Amino acid sequence: VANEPILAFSQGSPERDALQKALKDLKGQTEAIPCVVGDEEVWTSDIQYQLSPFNHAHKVAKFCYADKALLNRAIDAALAARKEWDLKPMADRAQVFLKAADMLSGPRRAEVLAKTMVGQGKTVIQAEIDAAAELIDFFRFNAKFAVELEGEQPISVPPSTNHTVYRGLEGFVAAISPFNFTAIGGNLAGAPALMGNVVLWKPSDTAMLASYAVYRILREAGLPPNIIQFVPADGPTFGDTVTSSEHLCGINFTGSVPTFKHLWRQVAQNLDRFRTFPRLAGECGGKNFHFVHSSADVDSVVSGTLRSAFEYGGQKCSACSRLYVPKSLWPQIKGRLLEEHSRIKVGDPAEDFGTFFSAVIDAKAFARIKKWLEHARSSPSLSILAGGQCNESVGYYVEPCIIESKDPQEPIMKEEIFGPVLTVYVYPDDKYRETLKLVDSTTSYGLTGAVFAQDKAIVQEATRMLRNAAGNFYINDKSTGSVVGQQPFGGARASGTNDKPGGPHYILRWTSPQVIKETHKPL
Amino acid sequence: SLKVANEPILAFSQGSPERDALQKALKDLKGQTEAIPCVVGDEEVWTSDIQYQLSPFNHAHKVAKFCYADKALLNRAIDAALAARKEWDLKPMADRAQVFLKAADMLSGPRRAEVLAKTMVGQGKTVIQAEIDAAAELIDFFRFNAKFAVELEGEQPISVPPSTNHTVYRGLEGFVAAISPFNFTAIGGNLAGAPALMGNVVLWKPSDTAMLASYAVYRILREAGLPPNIIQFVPADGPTFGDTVTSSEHLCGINFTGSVPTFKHLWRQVAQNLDRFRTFPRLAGECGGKNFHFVHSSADVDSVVSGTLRSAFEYGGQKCSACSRLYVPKSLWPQIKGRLLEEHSRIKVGDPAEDFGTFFSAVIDAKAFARIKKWLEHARSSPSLSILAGGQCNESVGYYVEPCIIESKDPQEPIMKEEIFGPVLTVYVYPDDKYRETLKLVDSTTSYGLTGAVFAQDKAIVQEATRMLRNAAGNFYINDKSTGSVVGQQPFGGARASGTNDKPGGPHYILRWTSPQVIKETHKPLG
Ligand SMILES: O=C(O)[C@H]1C[C@H](O)CN1
Ligand SMILES: O=C(O)[C@H]1C[C@H](O)CN1
Ligand SMILES: O=C(O)[C@H]1C[C@H](O)CN1
Ligand SMILES: O=C(O)[C@H]1C[C@H](O)CN1
């Protein structure tokens, strides 16, 4: 398999026309999205709404939270389907995901893009790289990795033959997905299912519309009933229920550090009830850096940093939120950042394809981000250089904000904001080595980071010094936009378990191998 | 790339160089006690907490005097290991691999007799059980893991213009605690050695009852070029060690083999301490089993009897993989019972250093002896159990237990469920026409999922049992015994209560001990 092409959406192109039609189709719509257990559409009385982030008067979906009883029925129904699904040849399971990938590439592309735009607030290009390219790539590449894994067999020596069976995990896997990438939800539920597992998928409330579109595509591509249960739910209720089940065998999570730690602690408390040791996989975000050396290409620093910090409103686990600049380059970088900032268009991405980014995801995110802007207006070490405005009357709109910090270890340099808020620390040129140490030591995180420099010795030194500051490390490129099969994604420190989805080893977390030795002569 | 093959098993025939060398090594050890220090860096350290390892078959012989590291020494060992880690992690994988390939060659040749003899005298193994463990399996772990690790670096992502992508297989940031069991010298070497190979630094707490052979392996690794502070040799009280390592902000992994309750305890301690760690520690555990041999009416009776006696009684049944429950159809029970009892009468229990005709020797220690004796007493009292052969034990000289065969009328009796770790085989006879229902009981009776075997010549029965027992055994055997997995041929491990199933012996085990970084370098200015 190869990576899915990124379409250009130029005027008069088939994909631009198809996307505009899909957006028109969605403009006034609310989809009633049920829980799905097997083939049954189930409604509880716990009704919830997903709002369009840039137009919160538009309820894009009405859904409901599964209660503990419904979640337990979903577990039981999934467990009863597991053995036959696990016994299927790997290639037959992979065929479901290859078919889904082709549907997403072609006839369903405009739908999943438009649902990601209207429901999660993405622009055309951000939806395209996510709900199409990244998701399609997860399905195709994981299918390839899984079929290839079957070829990894042990040595046989007569008179015995040895065979490894890549069993699914025994029990069910809980997939808990975040709002910010449609593709992550598809992968969190889809990768374990590919490996013969059955899954309770709790999608993010704020990504419900696009998540259900992916679910339906999987069912239409041939995924049998009870392999993935579509079970929106209150977060704590879902976590309490799955960690209380004797049949839990895995949690595939992406989201905040405290939530992942809480789930880890609940599993540990309940070890005596489980049939086997559950496998926890978590990617937990970052406080990601762009570090500039005086030899850097300033134009690349400026465009890469504006994109990394502000695309999708900075709502990426990989987004740059701390920029380190040498004093010698600061007049150039400050002047260019502030000028380009005034040309950033914030607005409705469905109505204006010129939009750079749109509203943040929901009222809670808006309130958190506003608190950080208020902090930047208060702190003696922080100065807002550009932006700082927000307005939630129509959508959850936050302008891009550029802040300078005189304190390299200010809280704003340490804590993940998940909004369009870039903090810059200007360091003296002769203190670049001490500043590299600050990049490594200042935060709890280890996810992404970039070095911009045209000096080979500097790049080699910075690569060594930052070895554990970033699991995805970039030289003369921006910190966002990892591509499946090219930059397997993840990091350690507080950023999670670093299972590298996007590479060939991720699927090994979702199989528990059995080795069969058959001896052909008497003992 | 690198070419490795399994280490050949030697015959130890009369007059052979290896038999003479082993006899000399045993003669050397017979009256000796080695004083084994803790080793931090290159420093030999003694604490006041003096302990002794006894020879299981002659417990008046203290084979080693060692000491338990105190919390101060454990924390000093952590600090010194962390100060050596970055340079070790930055070494090329092939340079780290060379240490383990050199150690493997030393174990294969000049040190073979030493590590075999120390495993025999200190752990109670016979010649052949020591040979397959302290030589073959350990040598194979070192060579095969070296090959797997060197080849892993060739697993690289796709590059597309204008950028080049490379994966760096970093060691984990922090230190790894390796906690090993008494019953295989090889497991201790792998638990500490595999993480070190991958660029980690390690505190190795060996088993008290395998101390002599464990230190011999440690010294060989150092002589093979392992730098100081990469593996700290820190015997310690178990709970004291676990408390210390799980309280360190720098813990990044625990590589464990032993009992289920100990692993769960460590898992809970890590979870309680999550807010102080720099990263999420990786716990790996293999935790034993209640392993089965299932016999179909079409089985080869001779294979059933020899394979079951070996699996149940070699090394006194003190194997995570040992058969402790035998399921026999009523039609074959007369043939199998008669042959089991006849062959049982020929099993020689004795001193393995003095009599190479010994089948197996004493169990490991007084605690194991006392537990096994309580199970034998339970077999005498229970109305569902009857002792068919064996049943006696005597600890006046060593911890000696006769091999014991018990028949249960209850397939759910506690003796069919709980791991004894002794030479105690329980037999359940089932009606031929209920083989399918009995297969379900094989699957559901215990909490474990480690090893199991089916003996049958009917291909359809084999296929049916293989499907029905898919999650009852991570190492499943068709017409062979449930013990004796070989590195690179049967990667070893299982799920359910048997642990995390990371399959040491196969190519994926080392992935638990690396945290990859991907570097993208872009060669054109951004637009
Ligand atoms: O993220 C996006 O949609 C595009 C729009 C702007 O040109 C920056 N990148
Ligand atoms: O921004 C990135 O690097 C990728 C990784 C994650 O799957 C979401 N997008
Ligand atoms: O385990 C051993 O040492 C050998 C002794 C007996 O012949 C069966 N195997
Ligand atoms: O008995 C066995 O199968 C192997 C597995 C473990 O390493 C100890 N010996």
H or E stretch including B21? helix B17-29
Q: Which of B503, B485, B487, B475 is nearest to B147 (CA)?
A: B487
Method of elucidation:
X-ray
The answer on A505 and A475 residing in a single domain is no
Residues forming a β-bridge with A445? A493
Distances (CA, A) of A323 to A286, B199, B272: 14, 31, 35
Angle at which helices B238-246 and B71-90 cross, to 10°: 60
Tell me whether residue A177 is annotated as binding.
yes
Q: Do A277 and B470 touch (CB under 8 A)?
A: no
- Identify the active-site residue in A64, A249, A317, A320: A317
Q: Do B522 and A477 touch (CB under 8 A)?
A: yes
The answer on A457 and A430 residing in a single domain is yes
DSSP-derived secondary structure letter, A497:
-
Sequence-separated (6 or more) residues with CB below 8 Å from residue B119: B125, B130, B133, B134, B185, B210, B213
The answer on B176 and B31 residing in a single domain is yes
Any alpha helices (H) in A66-129, and if so which ranges?
Answer: 68-87, 90-105, 109-120, 124-127
Q: What tokens does B112 get?
A: 């073979």
Atom of ligand 3 at shortest range from CA of B315: 1
Cβ pair A335, A424 in contact under 8 A: no
Q: Do A303 and B492 touch (CB under 8 A)?
A: no
DSSP-derived secondary structure letter, B206:
-
Sequence-separated (6 or more) residues with CB below 8 Å from residue A437: A465
A354-373 b/e (C-beta count within 10 Å ≥ 16 → b): ebbbbbbbbeebbeebbebb
Residue of A nearest to B173 (CA): A468
Please tell me whether residue A384 adopts helix, strand or coil conformation. strand
Which bound ligand lies closest to the C-alpha atom of A447? 2
Residue showing tokens 């595999």: B194
Return the CATH number at B229: 3.40.605.10
DSSP-derived secondary structure letter, A128:
I
Q: Do B480 and A505 touch (CB under 8 A)?
A: no
Distances (CA, A) of B511 to A273, A462, B349, B514: 28, 26, 42, 5
DSSP A57-77: EEEEEEEE---HHHHHHHHHH
- Identify the active-site residue in B286, B402, B407, B413: B286
Residue showing tokens 């559950």: A278
* Rounded CA separation A115/A123 (Å): 11
Using a 6 Å CB cutoff, which residues line ligand 3?
A: B 126, 128-129, 310, 314, 359
User: To 5 degrees, how large is the angle CA B249–CA B251–CA B256?
Assistant: 150
Tell me whether residue A482 is annotated as binding.
yes
Residues forming a β-bridge with A424? A323, A404
**A401-406: long-range contacts, CB 8 A cutoff, minimum separation 24:** A401/A373, A401/A376, A402/A337, A402/A338, A402/A341, A403/A376, A404/A334, A405/A381, A406/A381, A406/A382
Cβ pair B257, B181 in contact under 8 A: yes
Sequence-separated (6 or more) residues with CB below 8 Å from residue A300: A452, A476, B525, B526
Cβ pair A411, A442 in contact under 8 A: no
Distances (CA, A) of B491 to A507, B141, B363: 18, 11, 27
Task: Please state whether A201 falls in left (phi above 0), alpha (psi between -120 and 50) or beta.
Answer: beta
Q: What tokens does A115 get?
A: 């649902």
Quick check: is B18 catalytic? Answer: no
The answer on B296 and B197 residing in a single domain is no
Atom of ligand 4 at shortest range from CA of B320: 1
Residue showing tokens 């992502």: B157
Query: Resolution of the deposited coordinates, in angstroms?
Result: 1.4
Q: How many CB pairs under 8 A join A and B?
A: 220
* Rounded CA separation B286/B502 (Å): 8
The answer on A223 and A136 residing in a single domain is yes
- Identify the active-site residue in B67, B252, B320, B323: B320
Q: What tokens does B475 get?
A: 């190492």
Atom of ligand 1 at shortest range from CA of A355: 5
Angle at which helices A182-194 and A109-120 cross, to 10°: 120
> What end-to-end distance do the CA atoms of chain A give, in Å?
46
Atom of ligand 1 at shortest range from CA of A122: 3
User: To 5 degrees, how large is the angle CA A94–CA A99–CA A102?
Assistant: 130
Q: What tokens does A373 get?
A: 């802007």
Sign of CA dihedral B121, B127, B133, B136: positive
* Rounded CA separation B62/A101 (Å): 67
Q: Is the peptide bond before A154 cis (omega within 30 degrees of 0)?
A: no
**A426-433: long-range contacts, CB 8 A cutoff, minimum separation 24:** A426/A325, A426/A326, A426/A327, A426/A330, A427/A324, A427/A325, A427/A326, A427/A327, A428/A326, A428/A327, A429/A294, A429/A326, A429/A327, A429/A328, A432/A293, A432/A294, A432/A326, A432/A458, A433/A461
Cβ pair B279, B173 in contact under 8 A: yes
| CB-CB neighbours of B96 under 10 Å | 24
The answer on A428 and A418 residing in a single domain is yes
Q: What tokens does B8 get?
A: 């050949």
B393–chain A nearest CA distance, Å: 30
H or E stretch including A162? strand A160-168
Residue of A nearest to B452 (CA): A516
| CB-CB neighbours of A306 under 10 Å | 22
Q: What are phi and psi of B292, to 5 degrees?
A: -115, 150
A149–chain B nearest CA distance, Å: 11
- CA-based max dimension of chain A: 83
Cβ contacts of A501 on chain B, cutoff 8 Å: none
The answer on A371 and A231 residing in a single domain is no
Instruction: Fill in the amino acid letter for A240.
Output: D
Burial of B378 (0-12, 13-18, 19+ CB in 10 A): middle
The answer on A398 and A302 residing in a single domain is yes
H or E stretch including A460? helix A456-465
Quick check: is A317 catalytic? Answer: yes
Angle at which helices B138-152 and B93-108 cross, to 10°: 160
Considering only CA atoms, give the Rg of chain B.
Answer: 24
Q: In a mutational test of the pocket of ligand 3, which residue from B359, B361, B481, B483 has the highest number of ligand atoms less than 8 Å from its CB?
A: B359
Q: Which of A484, A449, A429 is nearest to A305 (CA)?
A: A449
The answer on B362 and B271 residing in a single domain is no
Domain encompassing residue B473? 288-486
Return the CATH number at A404: 3.40.309.10
Q: Which of A351, A306, A311, A302 is nearest to A127 (CA)?
A: A311
| Facing residue for B157 by CB, picked from A446, A478, A488 | A488
Cβ pair B516, B298 in contact under 8 A: no
* Rounded CA separation B265/A164 (Å): 31
Q: In a mutational test of the pocket of ligand 2, which residue from A482, A498, A500, A506 has the highest number of ligand atoms less than 8 Å from its CB?
A: A482
* Rounded CA separation B469/A161 (Å): 19
Cβ pair A441, A463 in contact under 8 A: no
* Rounded CA separation B432/B365 (Å): 41
Q: Which of B125, B151, B111, B149 is nearest to B25 (CA)?
A: B111
DSSP A181-231: -HHHHHHHHHHHHHTT-EEEEE--GGGHHHHHHHHHHHHHTTPPTTSEEE-
Q: How many domains does chain B have?
A: 2
Cβ contacts of B475 on chain A, cutoff 8 Å: 514-515, 517
- CA-based max dimension of chain B: 84
Residue B314 CA, chain-centre distance (Å), reads 15
* Rounded CA separation B494/B474 (Å): 4
A5–chain B nearest CA distance, Å: 12
Burial of A174 (0-12, 13-18, 19+ CB in 10 A): buried
Q: Is the peptide bond before B162 cis (omega within 30 degrees of 0)?
A: yes
Q: Which of B419, B327, B312, B328 is nearest to B375 (CA)?
A: B419
B250–chain A nearest CA distance, Å: 11
Burial of A108 (0-12, 13-18, 19+ CB in 10 A): buried
* Rounded CA separation A189/A113 (Å): 19
Task: Please state whether A496 falls in left (phi above 0), alpha (psi between -120 and 50) or beta.
Answer: left
Q: Do B167 and A264 touch (CB under 8 A)?
A: no
The answer on A244 and A298 residing in a single domain is no
A318 CA to centre of ligand 2 in angstroms: 6
Q: What tokens does A49 get?
A: 């709404």
Cβ pair A291, A473 in contact under 8 A: no
Sign of CA dihedral A508, A511, A512, A518: negative
Please tell me whether residue A124 adopts helix, strand or coil conformation. helix
Q: Is A489 in the pocket of ligand 2 (CB under 6 A)?
A: yes
Cβ pair A42, A71 in contact under 8 A: no
Q: Do B466 and A516 touch (CB under 8 A)?
A: yes
The answer on A278 and A266 residing in a single domain is yes
The answer on A368 and A261 residing in a single domain is no
DSSP-derived secondary structure letter, A346:
B
DSSP B96-161: HHHHHHHHHHHHHTTTHHHHHHHHHHHH---HHHHIIIIIIIHHHHHHHHHHHHHHHTT------T
Cβ pair B499, B285 in contact under 8 A: yes
Please tell me whether residue A253 adopts helix, strand or coil conformation. strand
Which bound ligand lies closest to the C-alpha atom of B355? 3
Q: Which of B462, B469, B464 is nearest to B496 (CA)?
A: B469
Q: Is A356 in the pocket of ligand 1 (CB under 6 A)?
A: yes
Which bound ligand lies closest to the C-alpha atom of B509? 4
